[PDB]
Amino acid sequence: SNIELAFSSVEHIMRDVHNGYILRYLHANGASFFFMVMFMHMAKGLYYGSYRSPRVTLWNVGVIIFTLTIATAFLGYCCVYGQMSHWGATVITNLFSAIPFVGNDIVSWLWGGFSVSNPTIQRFFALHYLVPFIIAAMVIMHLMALHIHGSSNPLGITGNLDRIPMHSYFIFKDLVTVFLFMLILALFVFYSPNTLGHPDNYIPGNPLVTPASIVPEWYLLPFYAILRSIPDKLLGVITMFAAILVLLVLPFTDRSVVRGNTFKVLSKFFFFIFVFNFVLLGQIGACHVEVPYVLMGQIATFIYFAYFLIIVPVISTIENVLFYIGRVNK
């Protein structure tokens, strides 16, 4: 973790440790897959209304795990101490300098110095090791919360009438995806290890030069984009953090009397509008801060939030009524 040795120890892993590269490429790519899957897992639930009914606490725990995973991930990205590392370390810790009074103090406290230096990278490794074990704990709670009500299902109705044990069905069904998962991760680790990364990170971090090519990790982009879309320093970070916290609102704004999107025409539509919007958001993030893109980023940010706050409640209420009048002849 020593700042003068950090980057090189990582190369030592790549160049000298037996299968060291396999270890590194697996960890790095495993990090991206973690998010591709996490996003899917989140989406499925967001679609099938898993955040509803008695499963709220389940969903709320899941939201914490999301915030924690993103944190763990960023702590680890700093450990390579490449250009992206250093500057990611810088910008992100500075996110707290937005806090009104104590601001700068929280920031220099974290750094443990005048700027991102040895103290920063060494405590960051320390913490990158610690959080995973907390996530693990957080997972067992996610499981305990799951276990009292069981999983939902695509129909969005009760599954009490027809149950089948986890063993010899879902143990084997799970195996299929496990393998499929490993097959694609192997394709990246062995044949395209660096496609998901950023080249700037192969250049040792330098405190006097931020590269004109600086771009956040692909899985952070949508959030990066939302922050860039607000021309105020403080509002920029408040809005960004809000974009994550807004997911907690969902069990209260979904006014529908039935669970899931399987039978809702207007919801399925607006769901995909949200999905793609999210991708567009992440795309704007990889772009520059230039004319058509800024405004685009702002329109999309609006949509993102407007989805949980306006669309869903407005749409679901209409669908409730639509479902009613379409068959009531009192």
Partner: protein
């Protein structure tokens, strides 16, 4: 505390030096840059300041290359104000180092320093 050989620095050039871990910007400004710095209405600055308040000697622009937004080092001779541009979130700085466009809330910082002939002692 750091000593920079000003006699070395040519005219239309920027120089970066390390001071307490943060980079210090020093530009040997041209007469056009100096005029362009002192000929800008405060109404167009979110953080108002005359180039006089910032520089001690109009020929040398000395400051901290730390973007006041989230801490990146702005790129020299870049932007839409012929100054510096922070690649991180798109902030623009003029030849006085004042914040023009972008999230950055304050003009680049002016450190403490004095001259001692053909050299400046920053710190």
């Amino acid at each position: 505390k750091v000593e920079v050989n000003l006699a070395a620095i040519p005219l239309g050039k920027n120089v970066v030096v390390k001071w307490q871990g943060k980079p210090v910007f020093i530009r040997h400004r041209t007469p056009h840059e100096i005029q362009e710095a002192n000929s800008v209405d405060m109404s167009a600055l979110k953080d108002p300041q005359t180039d006089a308040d910032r520089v001690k000697d109009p020929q040398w622009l000395i400051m901290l290359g730390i973007c006041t937004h989230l801490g990146c080092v702005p790129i020299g001779e870049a932007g839409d104000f012929g100054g510096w541009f922070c690649p991180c979130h798109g902030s623009h700085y003029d030849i006085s180092g004042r914040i023009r466009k972008g999230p950055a809330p304050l003009n680049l910082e002016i450190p403490a320093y004095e001259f001692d002939g053909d050299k400046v002692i920053v710190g």
